[PDB]
Amino acid sequence: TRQTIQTDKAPAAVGTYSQAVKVGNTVYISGQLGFDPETMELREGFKAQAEQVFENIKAICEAAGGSLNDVVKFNVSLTDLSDFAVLNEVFVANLSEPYPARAAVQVAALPKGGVVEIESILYI
Amino acid sequence: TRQTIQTDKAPAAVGTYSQAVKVGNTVYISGQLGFDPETMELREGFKAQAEQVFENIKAICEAAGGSLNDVVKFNVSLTDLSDFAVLNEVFVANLSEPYPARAAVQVAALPKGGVVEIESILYI
Amino acid sequence: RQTIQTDKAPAAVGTYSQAVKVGNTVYISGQLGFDPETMELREGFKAQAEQVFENIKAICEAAGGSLNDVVKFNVSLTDLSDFAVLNEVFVANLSEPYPARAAVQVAALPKGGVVEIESILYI
Numbered sequence: 001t002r003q004t005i006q007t008d009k010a011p012a013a014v015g016t017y018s019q020a021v022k023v024g025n026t027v028y029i030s031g032q033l034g035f036d037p038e039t040m041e042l043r044e045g046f047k048a049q050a051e052q053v054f055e056n057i058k059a060i061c062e063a064a065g066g067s068l069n070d071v072v073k074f075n076v077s078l079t080d081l082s083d084f085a086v087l088n089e090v091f092v093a094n095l096s097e098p099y100p101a102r103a104a105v106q107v108a109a110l111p112k113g114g115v116v117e118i119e120s121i122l123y124i
Numbered sequence: 125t126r127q128t129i130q131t132d133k134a135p136a137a138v139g140t141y142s143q144a145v146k147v148g149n150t151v152y153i154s155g156q157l158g159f160d161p162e163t164m165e166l167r168e169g170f171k172a173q174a175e176q177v178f179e180n181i182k183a184i185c186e187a188a189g190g191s192l193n194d195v196v197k198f199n200v201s202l203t204d205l206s207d208f209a210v211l212n213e214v215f216v217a218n219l220s221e222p223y224p225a226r227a228a229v230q231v232a233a234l235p236k237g238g239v240v241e242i243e244s245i246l247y248i
Numbered sequence: 249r250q251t252i253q254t255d256k257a258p259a260a261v262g263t264y265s266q267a268v269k270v271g272n273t274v275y276i277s278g279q280l281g282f283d284p285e286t287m288e289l290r291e292g293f294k295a296q297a298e299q300v301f302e303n304i305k306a307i308c309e310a311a312g313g314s315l316n317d318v319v320k321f322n323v324s325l326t327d328l329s330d331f332a333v334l335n336e337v338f339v340a341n342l343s344e345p346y347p348a349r350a351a352v353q354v355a356a357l358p359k360g361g362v363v364e365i366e367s368i369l370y371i
Contacts, residue, residue: 031350103155227278
């Protein structure tokens with residue numbers, strides 16, 4: 001019933017947490033930053049980090065037995081809401097309608113100096 | 125199975141998201157800002173925006189077949205914690221006991237220059 | 249649906265309940281580093297973070313579970329430089345497998361706290 005997901009197709013945790021926890025058909029995916037999992041280096045710039053975040057989330061979704069289509073809620077933390085338009089473009093490029101529920105805020109800073117962090121909840 | 129919730133009585137999404145997603149008895153409501161749902165203009169000042177956020181959430185609750193009494197968790201983002209006392213007053217005016225679980229933080233900024241965003245989870 | 253309330257954890261400082269349990273899932277309110285006996289914040293980041301874990305653990309137990317049932321934590325810091333000690337406090341208070349997590353630096357927290365942690369359990 002409860003599984004702790006761990007796949008090296010997504011970035012290793014950079015703190016004391018697991019990549020995702022699945023309970024029943026619900027999955028809680030940790031905040032993902034724009035790391036290339038092979039190097040654990042952030043991509044350069046907001047757009048590349050946001051695209052990488054989606055790759056990272058997708059890899060965890062698949063290791064949890066689902067896909068991005070199973071996301072019901074995303075929580076987005078940006079360090080600059082000037083990036084909101086490109087955020088929305090990256091969402092369109094990676095998702096199909098109907099889109100999940102979402103929240104979005106500008107924070108002061110993010111782990112490892114990322115400029116975008118996205119958390120996810122799935123129902124598979 | 126997922127059901128996406130939409131109502132013209134709440135603001136249209138200002139980004140790539142749905143107003144809410146329902147899975148069984150659980151509903152994930154997107155962050156709501158203090159927009160008038162017809163004009164998409166923010167109300168003037170914190171109190172009016174907070175009251176409008178509650179009207180927007182209530183509309184989505186009703187579209188999902190529930191009410192504010194079904195909220196189990198609110199997540200509040202403020203741009204000024206000086207508004208905390210009035211936030212708590214607006215909560216009392218709009219809710220009956222038992223109150224939901226909550227978190228509240230001061231963020232750096234919110235989309236479109238709002239001063240309050242509230243996300244909600246229901247169990248109907 | 250149960251609204252949890254135990255004075256082993258801090259009283260709510262606003263219009264909310266400590267936690268709500270629905271079925272197997274528990275939503276625990278954001279906790280700050282208050283000593284429940286005095287409703288005063290502990291002094292400094294590390295003491296507040298340790299107290300937050302005591303406060304969350306008390307609510308977990310009042311909800312019929314334990315810290316081992318947490319599936320997700322959401323951490324709000326007022327300074328990213330506290331991230332290293334945050335992770336040390338997590339190791340000291342949790343056993344593997346660790347819950348999922350998110351963490352950000354916010355501008356400020358209620359009552360001048362320097363850390364707030366929200367929790368979701370599955371019991």
